[PDB]
Design a protein around this ligand. Structure first.
Ligand SMILES: *[C@@H]1O[C@H](CO)[C@@H](O[C@@H]2O[C@H](CO)[C@@H](O)[C@H](O)[C@H]2NC(C)=O)[C@H](O)[C@H]1NC(C)=O
Ligand SMILES: *[C@@H]1O[C@H](CO)[C@@H](O[C@@H]2O[C@H](CO)[C@@H](O)[C@H](O)[C@H]2NC(C)=O)[C@H](O)[C@H]1NC(C)=O
Ligand SMILES: COC(=O)CN1Cc2c(nc(C)c(CN)c2-c2ccc(Cl)cc2Cl)C1=O
Ligand SMILES: COC(=O)CN1Cc2c(nc(C)c(CN)c2-c2ccc(Cl)cc2Cl)C1=O
Ligand SMILES: CC(=O)N[C@@H]1[C@@H](O)[C@H](O)[C@@H](CO)O[C@H]1O
Ligand SMILES: *[C@@H]1O[C@H](CO)[C@@H](O)[C@H](O)[C@H]1NC(C)=O
Ligand SMILES: *[C@@H]1O[C@H](CO)[C@@H](O)[C@H](O)[C@H]1NC(C)=O
Ligand SMILES: *[C@@H]1O[C@H](CO)[C@@H](O)[C@H](O)[C@H]1NC(C)=O
Ligand SMILES: *[C@@H]1O[C@H](CO)[C@@H](O)[C@H](O)[C@H]1NC(C)=O
Ligand SMILES: *[C@@H]1O[C@H](CO)[C@@H](O)[C@H](O)[C@H]1NC(C)=O
Ligand SMILES: *[C@@H]1O[C@H](CO)[C@@H](O)[C@H](O)[C@H]1NC(C)=O
Ligand SMILES: *[C@@H]1O[C@H](CO)[C@@H](O)[C@H](O)[C@H]1NC(C)=O
Ligand SMILES: *[C@@H]1O[C@H](CO)[C@@H](O)[C@H](O)[C@H]1NC(C)=O
Ligand SMILES: *[C@@H]1O[C@H](CO)[C@@H](O)[C@H](O)[C@H]1NC(C)=O
Lengths: 727, 727
């Protein structure tokens, strides 16, 4: 009988099916099938072919992706796609007129465009090229240039610099249409005095001299980019006169020093919400800015600011939370940490003090998913007090005591982890179950929360998997210091608690992380358990999220401490359970996981025979400002420098003579710079410790090229097997 | 007895003693002993403390080296030494007045000085600072600036650029004083359009942003530096006027294209000898330039030019040979390949054509060591027909047939490999034997070649070794197509020819190499054999040197062919022998030996179980122009592009599936760039080949920092032990 093998993982023998749909109104969505784009009707479920797979057979370009305008009239073809960072890329674009059934060859969008976006209604375009913003009112018309200051690596108009892309917006885009399509609001980043990270890129053999890449990248404590915010009136664009961009300045309480622009949210046609964050991330201000027909300006009455401070930690999970505005724009809801340090939905009224908590309890709201005049819909982990579960809920605005679980009972044994996607106005929603069973995609009508139809049930995979000796997953908790800390175990098939198993501790452990959940996954761990009979465990210790601030904030200004400790204690706890061979306990982790793995291996606890660290952080000054300073403050004598210095991997090099260690890193890693591992190895060498290593030429933090991905997991499997004396 | 362990090797428990002396005249030499600098009288052996170690105890800095003026009145104190490349470095200098017995304290030699040399007689000084040349007639007086054009990385006056340092002069210095001390000849290098190799330097843990190092470095086929030659009259310096330099122009036959300046030899007070080499190293011209007392010009009669060509390969072993001029500078002797392709001594007379061979036979002269009116002294490998042996000979200038060997029989069992050092005018000579027994330094008088005394017999080290089971060395040969090819084997103690032993093949194998010889080494192989009972073998196949052009030139324009092939065939030959476990055969090599080890490992021969390659070349376009083009020509379609592309390691990646490979490279390698290995590993990952790797943070080609050195051999030893299943 067979098992889930390494080749299965690497080669994708058993594929998860999905159902990715694009709502295009209050009752229809688009859906790709045989590369035919179909349009569906939510209420009745009937469909027709919106775009035939054949339409562009004569395009003479492989088509990367497509974007239909809000009004159906036009579709954007994305080709020549070249990836930059986690979100950024370049591409060439073409516009196809749907009514005329024709490619547009007039006033085309330039190659090497950095970003493109339809207006939210109609068919207007905004795009960025050479760091400047252009606007096309109609596809076949000359575009209007909005900014002239754009300049590679120095001035970014309408797009983010490296650190804004990665740590702040989670996007390349830095443009925001008003609901109307009347205003285009945008940010400008100035990286003039941001230092450059520099590394070699070797490329194809034929390249004689290696390239040096140079990326403005503020390390902890370094000079940060600066930011401005502008709003342009798209209706009044001259062909003679330049576009008059109106600037909105950050509150004076932010201007006093370094700060970030961290959220942009149109409330109405004439109200924009701006959240700003001090470089010290325990203080942020939400501005409410109104447009003035008479002056054409925008004013943010100081009196109506909204202020957030934290004292236990930083602000928000990873950032101040997103505001969700009631349609009229005079109030909003947003997730806020209550007085017991739990994250719950708060109701805010413009021009009124405080806010009002509409939810409470020892559990947390994960997200606000939709808002109607009667209901607010959110995801939380309240069901069964499982912090690693997700369920959809709705709360009646006219009586907060009335909360209905929409997903809890749909199928209580297969589905414990949901995400949701609502139609415009939310007449329908698509529920997406991620586990613990096979993923299940279903459609529902809001009116009386009625199941309409099943979209995808992964029955095809279920069948295949029935023929395989698959692992099972235990999700549970242990109690330390009278506190529940949750963990999971992927257990080998025909598990026998009277046998001894080798145990590999799979670690991430970064602030607000969660490695114990109810999600179904087919990954490297599946293979280790199925084929090699290894228990793969993870554990959520202090620092972990979704369980309140008392736990999440335990790591405030003290990274590489409690979260490192707790991993070690959890492994102590796992052995005491009678089915673990304490002579064979390993540990591995990527990114922040590689750091923690390293710190543990270097702790000298003698609990771990061996471990692997992939692209780990080695010391916090090496990593980016926005992320690092959030948890560690500044590395100055007046601030937290002492703990910056007491928390390096290097400083533990001696203890590595107790373990077998494998360090791996990509040479073109723009994120966790190869530097971080280069310093780890030099410290190990300098102190006489043997270890194993592997670099990946031209791979970034993802090491995700098809060949490298395969190569690394093959390399690590060999290492773990050796370590465990496995055949 | 105990064994010779890895620790002994790395800790240098068994030290070889040396006797390094400097001839200061025809009959005295300087010798440093316990940091006391002594003068010695050669005839009688008596001595004097020229300078007590106590002398600079309050100096204030650690003194790195010292240089005593020829006339013994001054001594340079070199301190603050920072290493650059193989030969180059900067340092600070103080001068100490022997008479006055004090430190000159004004008009000091600047900090960050690049080269200093005393004139050949007296106490003038030449030095280089910020790429410009300066001269001091007296240590206390202010210097005169000879050149004003110096610019970092661009204009080099009196010092070499990277590639000239490494491949041409084997020195940083480009300064030549006339024997007199009147003239100062210097070269000037222009690297204006030479491409720069760029790589990261990580530095200490505290450096936040890696530094990027940038070095002008011509890769094969790229733009080479250009070169100019100048001579200044050091006597007529003016404190008011800029000093005037006379340029010596390369011959017309060199100026037609790219060329090098490869040799500068003063022949008399007023005759200078310049050798030039075409970028195609097929062709060289020696110029003889005479000083015109009136013209104040230097002239090179075309009629005097001596032209050296080759149709078989390149010119010289690694470069045109150096000329040795007779007293009057009217004639000279030079090593030259004869009609049978053997390298022998040739006698030239200025203003006459062609030349006369004064030695011949199927062996080769290695170097001309001293010249008198009665005899010419030289080192050759004639004795007992052994190519790996070395002996001092003299040949009677009035009868070439009368050639007497001066060392062959001193101690024929202990000594078969000698180098030599003569006093001025060759009155005395020091002999330095290096094997196959322990090194032995003797002193001798030329008048009747009588032995005067033993300087160092290594009796201490002999004693220590009595308590150690040392390996032994076999030096034999084998036949490949009716031709002899030499090899050596470090054999374990108590070698039993009935048993099977694993065998590690130690390879360099570059053009004109020799790894089979009679010298005594305490090294890694010594450990492998003594302790782990491994046979380490080296083999000199085609392309190896000192056996004539037929062999050395076999590889011309075809690196990575016969020499790779022949290493393999030697392995097979060894498998034939009945004390070799043909299932346990490894291979390893550094630098060129790394390239070869890789090409062999990817041959698919099946002969080798595993191998290690340390900072190997992978593609010839990645290495430097002077060295690569010497054997490969240019990487153009016109010239040798096809073989450049057919000789890469990357193209063999698939066959590595058949072997265990370990690939090691220092990240700061300025010589064989990390690039080279970066391109190997990528090709290996692209095709699913698993292998082992290790990078050395901030180490260069030498990987010689004490800790890294200890680390690389510890890692490699684990690998080899593992591959041979040794406990
Ligand atoms: C981006 O920031 C840079 C750096 O501050 C600005 O350059 C400065 O501009 C001022 C005022 O024009 C000059 O007096 C300074 O000399 C400049 N300093 C530096 C470091 O260059 C630049 O103006 C900003 N660019 C934009 C368009 O916002
Ligand atoms: C070093 O070589 C460079 C490149 O040939 C010389 O630069 C040229 O020199 C003259 C004027 O200086 C003109 O041909 C060009 O303006 C220069 N071209 C380039 C590429 O710069 C330079 O003069 C040389 N320097 C010395 C001291 O010889
Ligand atoms: C469970 O696995 C993961 O969470 C993988 N990661 C790591 C990760 C991801 N996303 C963002 C935005 C960030 C912040 N830089 C990170 C991240 C976090 C810590 C370090 Cl030290 C490095 C990195 Cl890059 C992501 O997807
Ligand atoms: C037996 O050990 C050795 O031969 C060690 N080497 C290698 C070496 C040495 N010297 C010079 C001048 C050179 C020319 N660049 C080299 C060399 C030769 C070929 C390559 Cl591919 C790389 C290199 Cl660096 C030296 O001492
Ligand atoms: C018509 C007009 O004013 N257009 C201007 C242009 O002249 C100027 O070059 C640019 C930069 O300032 O701004 C825009
Ligand atoms: C669904 O059916 C109705 C009635 O036939 C039709 O009007 C509508 O266009 C159909 N929708 C799709 C998406 O095919
Ligand atoms: C994009 O580049 C291609 C390649 O030459 C060119 O043919 C095309 O015209 C460019 N597209 C636009 C809109 O400039
Ligand atoms: C959108 O809102 C703005 C707000 O002033 C208004 O001027 C404009 O008329 C609106 N656009 C449309 C399409 O009506
Ligand atoms: C529990 O408390 C003890 C203090 O007695 C501490 O050492 C340990 O780290 C704590 N563990 C957890 C998980 O909080
Ligand atoms: C200096 O010289 C004396 C012998 O004259 C010697 O005994 C002493 O140890 C030396 N000091 C050193 C080695 O620095
Ligand atoms: C050696 O001895 C002789 C005789 O006294 C003396 O003249 C000479 O200076 C001595 N040489 C040295 C180097 O001390
Ligand atoms: C070199 O600098 C050192 C101190 O760094 C100082 O002793 C000296 O003055 C300098 N030397 C000269 C002559 O420039
Ligand atoms: C050295 O030789 C040069 C060239 O002939 C001459 O000008 C000078 O006088 C000589 N100096 C000495 C040391 O006699
Ligand atoms: C000997 O000759 C054979 C036949 O050409 C050839 O394959 C081999 O490479 C040669 N070996 C040597 C070492 O010359």
């Amino acid at each position: 009988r067979k098992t889930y093998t390494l080749t299965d993982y690497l080669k994708n023998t058993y594929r998860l099916k999905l159902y990715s749909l694009r709502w295009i109104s209050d009752h229809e969505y688009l859906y790709k099938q045989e590369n035919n784009i179909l349009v569906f009707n939510a209420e009745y479920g009937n469909s027709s072919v919106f775009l035939e797979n054949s339409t562009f057979d004569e395009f003479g370009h492989s088509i990367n992706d497509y974007s239909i305008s809000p009004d159906g009239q036009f579709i954007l073809l994305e080709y020549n796609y070249v990836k930059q960072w986690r979100h950024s890329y370049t591409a060439s674009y073409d516009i196809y007129d749907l009514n005329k059934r024709q490619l547009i060859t007039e006033e085309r969008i330039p190659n090497n465009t950095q970003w493109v976006t339809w207006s939210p209604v109609g068919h207007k375009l905004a795009y960025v090229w050479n760091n400047d913003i252009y606007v096309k009112i109609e596809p076949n018309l000359p575009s209007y240039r909005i900014t002239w200051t754009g300049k590679e690596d120095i001035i970014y108009n309408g797009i983010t610099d490296w650190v804004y892309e990665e740590e702040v917006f989670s996007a390349y885009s830095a443009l925001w249409w008003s609901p109307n399509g009347t205003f285009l609001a945008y940010a400008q980043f100035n990286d003039t005095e941001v230092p450059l990270i520099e590394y070699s890129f070797y490329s194809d053999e034929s390249l004689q001299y290696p390239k040096t890449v140079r990326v403005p990248y503020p390390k902890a404590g370094a000079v940060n980019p600066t930011v401005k915010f502008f709003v342009v009136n798209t209706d009044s664009l001259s062909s003679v006169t330049n576009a008059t961009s109106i600037q909105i300045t950050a509150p004076a309480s932010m201007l006093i020093g370094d700060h970030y622009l961290c959220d942009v949210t149109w409330a109405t046609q004439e109200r924009i919400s701006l959240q700003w964050l001090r470089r010290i991330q325990n203080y942020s201000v939400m501005d409410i800015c109104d447009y003035d027909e008479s002056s054409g300006r925008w004013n943010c009455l100081v009196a109506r600011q909204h202020i957030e401070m934290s004292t236990t930690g930083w602000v928000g999970r990873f950032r101040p939370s997103e505001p969700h505005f009631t349609l009229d724009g005079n109030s909003f809801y947003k997730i806020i940490s209550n007085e017991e340090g739990y994250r719950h939905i708060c109701y805010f009224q413009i021009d009124k003090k405080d806010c009002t908590f509409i939810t409470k309890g020892t559990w947390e709201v994960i997200g606000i998913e939709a808002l109607t005049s009667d209901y607010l819909y959110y995801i939380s982990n309240e069901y069964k007090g499982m912090p690693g579960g997700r369920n959809l809920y709705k709360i009646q605005l006219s009586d907060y005591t009335k909360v209905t679980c929409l997903s809890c009972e749909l199928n209580p044994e297969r589905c414990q982890y949901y995400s949701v996607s609502f139609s415009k106005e939310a007449k329908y929603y698509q529920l997406r179950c991620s586990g613990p069973g096979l993923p299940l995609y279903t459609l529902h009508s809001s009116v009386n929360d009625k199941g309409l139809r099943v979209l995808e049930d992964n029955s095809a995979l279920d069948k295949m998997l029935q023929n395989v000796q698959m692992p099972s997953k235990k999700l549970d908790f242990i109690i330390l210091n009278e506190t529940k800390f949750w963990y999971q175990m992927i257990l080998p098939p025909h598990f026998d608690k009277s046998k001894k198993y080798p145990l590999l501790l799979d670690v991430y452990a970064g602030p607000c992380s969660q490695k114990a959940d109810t999600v179904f996954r087919l990954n490297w761990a599946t293979y280790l358990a199925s084929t090699e009979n290894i228990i793969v465990a993870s554990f959520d210790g202090r620092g972990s999220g979704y369980q309140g601030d008392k736990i999440m904030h335990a790591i405030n200004r003290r990274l590489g401490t409690f979260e490192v400790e707790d991993q070690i204690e959890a492994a102590r706890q796992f052995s005491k359970m009678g089915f673990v061979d304490n002579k064979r306990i390993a540990i591995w982790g990527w990114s922040y996981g590689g750091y923690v793995t390293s710190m543990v291996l270097g702790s000298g606890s003698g609990v771990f025979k061996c471990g692997i660290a992939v692209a780990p952080v080695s010391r916090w000054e090496y990593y980016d400002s926005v992320y690092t300073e959030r948890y560690m403050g500044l590395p100055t004598p007046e601030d937290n420098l002492d703990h910056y210095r007491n928390s390096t991997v290097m400083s533990r090099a001696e203890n590595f003579k107790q373990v077998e260690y494998l360090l791996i890193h990509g040479t073109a890693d723009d994120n966790v710079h190869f530097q971080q591992s280069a310093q780890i190895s030099k410290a190990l060498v300098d102190v006489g410790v043997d270890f194993q290593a592997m670099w990946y030429t031209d791979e970034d933090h993802g090491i995700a090229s098809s060949t490298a991905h395969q190569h690394i997991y093959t390399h690590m499997s060999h290492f773990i097997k050796q370590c465990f004396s496995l055949p």
